[PDB]
Amino acid sequence: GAMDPGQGGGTHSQWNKPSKPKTNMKHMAGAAAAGAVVGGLGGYMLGSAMSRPIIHFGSDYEDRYYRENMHRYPNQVYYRPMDEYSNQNNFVHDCVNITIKQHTVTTTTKGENFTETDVKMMERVIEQMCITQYERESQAYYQRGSS
């Protein structure tokens, strides 16, 4: 439209982010250590790692007992490091079966057992544990060679 001069100024804005924390009591509980022993594989080679599986279920069974076995589950797997044309996920597909089979049968042989619960809770461990072996091996390889 038309244009005319004007005068004004100033700018400000609100700030609404309060926080009021409180302290809480503390407690501590015990835990136990456990592990597994392999009987044999007959055609697969064992890789290098330390036990560190990390899985979250957001379910009842994770707190009920899985938290105790979380520390007993290994990270090393049995796989084909030989000259085989495999994609990263392809050798993992083969790896999950052989790793969970040797773990479930050896507990049964040791006088322990496994149920549907054990299959389900361990499957999620083993899925990532197989790819974790490759990703850590390949990282070591590009740094200082495989170990």
C-alpha distances out from residue 125 to 31, 37, 143, Å: 20, 17, 27
26: tokens are 């503390």
Number of domains in the chain: 1
List strand residue ranges (DSSP E) for the chain, in order.
45-46, 78-79
Q: DSSP string covering 63-84, please?
A: IIIIHHHTTT--S--EE--SS-
Which domain covers residue 135, as residue numbers?
Answer: 1-147
Angle at 136 between CA 130 and CA 140, to 5 degrees: 145
Name the phi and psi angles at 99, rounded to 5. -70, -45
Technique behind the model: NMR
What type of residue is 4?
D
